[PDB]
Amino acid sequence: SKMRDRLFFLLSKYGIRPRDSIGQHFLIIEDVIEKAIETANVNENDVILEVGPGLGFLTDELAKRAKKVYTIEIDQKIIEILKKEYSWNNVKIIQGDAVRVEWPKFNKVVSNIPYKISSPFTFKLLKTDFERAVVMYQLEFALRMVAKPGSRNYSRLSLMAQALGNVEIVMKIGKGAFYPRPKVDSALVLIEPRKDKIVLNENLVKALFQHRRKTVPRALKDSIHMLGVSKDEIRGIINNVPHSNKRVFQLYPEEVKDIEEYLKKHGIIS
Numbered sequence: 001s002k003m004r005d006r007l008f009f010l011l012s013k014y015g016i017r018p019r020d021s022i023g024q025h026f027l028i029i030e031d032v033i034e035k036a037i038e039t040a041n042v043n044e045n046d047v048i049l050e051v052g053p054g055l056g057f058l059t060d061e062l063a064k065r066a067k068k069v070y071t072i073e074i075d076q077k078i079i080e081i082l083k084k085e086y087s088w089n090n091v092k093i094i095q096g097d098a099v100r101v102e103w104p105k106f107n108k109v110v111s112n113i114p115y116k117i118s119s120p121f122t123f124k125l126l127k128t129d130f131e132r133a134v135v136m137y138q139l140e141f142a143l144r145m146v147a148k149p150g151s152r153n154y155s156r157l158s159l160m161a162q163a164l165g166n167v168e169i170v171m172k173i174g175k176g177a178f179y180p181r182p183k184v185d186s187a188l189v190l191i192e193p194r195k196d197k198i199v200l201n202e203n204l205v206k207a208l209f210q211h212r213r214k215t216v217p218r219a220l221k222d223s224i225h226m227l228g229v230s231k232d233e234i235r236g237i238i239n240n241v242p243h244s245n246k247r248v249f250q251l252y253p254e255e256v257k258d259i260e261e262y263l264k265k266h267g268i269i270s
């Protein structure tokens with residue numbers, strides 16, 4: 001009630017509707033916020049990236065614990081409310097689409113993630129140098145992020161998560177926890193950078209996972225013909241490709257790496 005009332009009061013004070021769009025929901029539970037923050041072990045030395053501060057409930061908690069918070073927000077009207085409603089010495093608001101603007105240097109991310117950017121944000125983050133991220137997604141998307149090779153929901157996002165991160169779902173978050181109540185539950189995800197990162201070619205993985213249900217001979221032939229190359233000058237090389245008895249969705253990052261190295265050696269991806 002206490003944080004839901006306070007939301008209701010802010011929205012009417014400014015006279016703004018709770019969403020311009022349809023993949024956006026406001027965390028209105030004090031203890032989930034404080035749980036996100038204790039899971040990330042935010043300390044007086046940390047420099048934190050937040051995305052989509054909304055009405056700044058999470059932001060405000062981060063500002064009182066961290067050295068510096070950078071928070072990225074697309075809606076210029078939200079930004080004006082944040083500036084009038086709060087008095088942080090150590091918060092830097094960046095107007096922008098979080099998927100497009102240059103990110104600050106940070107050592108951690110503590111953030112609710114607007115669900116519409118769940119995928120693009122995650123790929124961008126997995127390619128950053130951060131100590132620890134604690135982030136909220138829909139539960140379906142979080143189950144994808146920890147899907148195992150050869151399982152039915154395993155996809156490009158799963159591979160890159162496994163290849164580049166250690167990913168833990170920390171707990172379910174009930175739909176009661178946001179306004180307006182989502183139609184499915186969310187999940188609090190911990191991501192640390194993998195100690196021994198497997199660095200894979202983006203174009204290759206996109207190629208392979210364009211249709212992840214195919215065998216890897218098939219997947220490779222199609223993607224490289226689509227680029228504009230002859231089929232005849234590609235067939236024989238592809239049919240000594242390693243892991244060729246797998247469908248793409250069954251591939252470990254290690255196996256994708258061998259396909260890369262193989263294609264690299266035959267000058268296809270160079």
Ligand SMILES: CSC[C@H]1O[C@@H](n2cnc3c(N)ncnc32)[C@H](O)[C@@H]1O
Pocket residue numbers: 024025026051052053054055072073074075078096097098099112113114117
């Ligand atoms: C976290 S759920 C709500 C907040 O996310 C913000 N938001 C939505 N989409 C984006 C985006 N692409 N980049 C940054 N902030 C966003 C909205 O303005 C809202 O305040």
Ligand SMILES: O=S([O-])[O-]
Pocket residue numbers: 022023024025115182183184
């Ligand atoms: O609108 S929410 O359910 O993505």
Ligand SMILES: [Zn+2]
Pocket residue numbers: 060086087
């Ligand atoms: Zn405050």
Ligand SMILES: [Zn+2]
Pocket residue numbers: 140
């Ligand atoms: Zn689905």
Ligand SMILES: [Zn+2]
Pocket residue numbers: 225
């Ligand atoms: Zn053709």
Ligand SMILES: [Zn+2]
Pocket residue numbers: 242243244246255
């Ligand atoms: Zn194999």
